[PDB]
């Protein structure tokens, strides 16, 4: 049969870019459901499924709301193949602002979708995989999730929560058959990061003039990094194929290395004091 | 004045023996307010100060539920000092059994005490040591938040959060004044821990015959390494007082050295080959 394919976080990102690479592969192997929180946003997806001619049925899209249980099953219980080969565990979003300045309810959210949702995906998804002996999970990661980045605390947690638990699963799925891999993303261009072009009063009116003023000139470095590093989502996609097809596939894939000089700062120096430092210069 | 400190989760634990071991220090140099979400539960702790003999007023408990932020805020409108020098984000709690087999209401309350309530505290007590230029954040760490550990996903994920959480304010912090330093525990002679003794059809039920055998073979393997590894509670409360009197602290300070090698072999292979094989075999 195709290998029916799950993506969660299709709307746009790596994850639209994903869905159609997949659903277009020249060899019709690849049966996808790309799923959205809300189809009122499915236009992208289908307007580049055109673009990519990809043949009809390829490509589902489905509502699943990854912080819905009910939803998550629902979406299971459409997928009519009653099977699902390789899931990809996309939907993420970003949370950046001093941390006095975040709501509760947003570094909620934050938690619940990266984190809680992915365990969600994962409880209604493993299973199965595990009683017939194969599967393949590809966790989209980040850079943010292997060192910390100032005015990122909350989506860093995040993203490091995913490493603990993904490393803690792959620890016991390894005699099972089926695989586990995080793709670490550096900057992509893709909206929001690079989008970002605002900073309100609501941060001045809930932190200090020094930390604002830091915030500030992290927005700055941030912008200049992201024009220097960020990527075609084209280029990222196709890591998740290199994933995808590997025979033994290892835990980590980074599509860049562009970030590893100061990730060896990181465990060249366990105590924290090198990196830390290094980075506040770096920003600073 | 004295060292205005408050600490989160004394009802047992490393909470517990801090609190007395700072209210009781022979220099009176420490006041202290030891929280507890359920006062039913401030008897050990007394006798506890009782037995070391603190002098009337070195230690005030204060009911606070990190889950809680309106607890959280009137647990602050109780210190008189109208200061806290030392805050130790202590709360938190386990989870372990295979992933398939948690409730998504438990996987919920780990992120939500351990991350989420640690934000909480962060947000109340960090603007006030940002202003005066001067603090000392003390967030209780674990092995378990440097590597994964089969059968704790969730858990794991909650301390990796705290990882990435703190690394990134202290790269902002690093100018302010105030300090934030994680203390990596590895098993401690504490209840839970070595009190796991049950695996009831719960889990059976909720999961498949494999998986559970492999439960049996890890809680087995867990209950050697804490017979031959877990520390003293006091030996652990110790470094704490280590980090907490040095001049220019660390990022991190570890119990032990114990679990070191395993933690080499971790960032000596950043794709996960090595760490998630070692542990593998390590384990089964």
């Given at each position: 049969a195709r290998t029916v394919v799950l993506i969660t976080?299709?709307?746009?990102?790596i994850g639209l870019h994903l869905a159609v690479r997949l659903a277009s592969?020249?060899?019709?192997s690849f049966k996808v459901y790309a799923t959205l929180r809300?189809?009122?946003?499915?236009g992208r997806l289908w307007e580049a499924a055109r673009a990519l001619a990809?043949?009809?049925?390829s490509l589902e899209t489905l509502q699943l709301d990854v912080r819905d249980s009910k939803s998550v099953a629902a979406a299971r219980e459409r997928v009519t193949e009653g099977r699902v080969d390789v899931l990809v565990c996309n939907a993420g979003l970003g949370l950046l602002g001093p941390l006095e300045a975040l709501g509760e309810d947003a570094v909620a959210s934050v938690l619940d979708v990266n984190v809680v949702g992915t365990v969600r995906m994962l409880q209604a998804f493993l299973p199965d995989m595990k009683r017939r002996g194969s599967g393949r999970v590809l966790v989209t990661g980040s850079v943010g999730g292997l060192m910390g980045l100032p005015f990122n605390d909350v989506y860093c947690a995040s993203k490091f929560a995913l490493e603990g638990l993904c490393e803690s699963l792959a620890v016991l799925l390894l005699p099972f058959g089926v695989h586990l891999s995080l793709i670490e993303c550096g900057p992509?261009?893709?909206?929001f990061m690079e989008k970002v072009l605002g900073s309100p009063e609501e941060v001045l009116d809930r932190t200090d003039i020094h930390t604002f003023h830091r915030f500030y000139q992290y927005l700055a470095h941030s912008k200049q990094v992201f024009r220097e590093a960020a990527q075609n989502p084209e280029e990222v996609a196709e890591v998740f194929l290199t994933a995808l097809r590997a025979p033994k596939p290892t835990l980590r894939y980074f599509?860049?290395?562009?970030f590893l000089p100061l990730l060896r700062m990181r465990l060249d120096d366990p105590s924290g004091s090198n990196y830390v430092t290094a980075m506040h210069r770096e920003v600073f």
């Open positions: 976080g299709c709307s746009s990102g592969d020249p060899s019709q809300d189809l009122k946003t499915q990809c043949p009809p049925g992509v261009h893709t909206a599509t860049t290395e562009r």
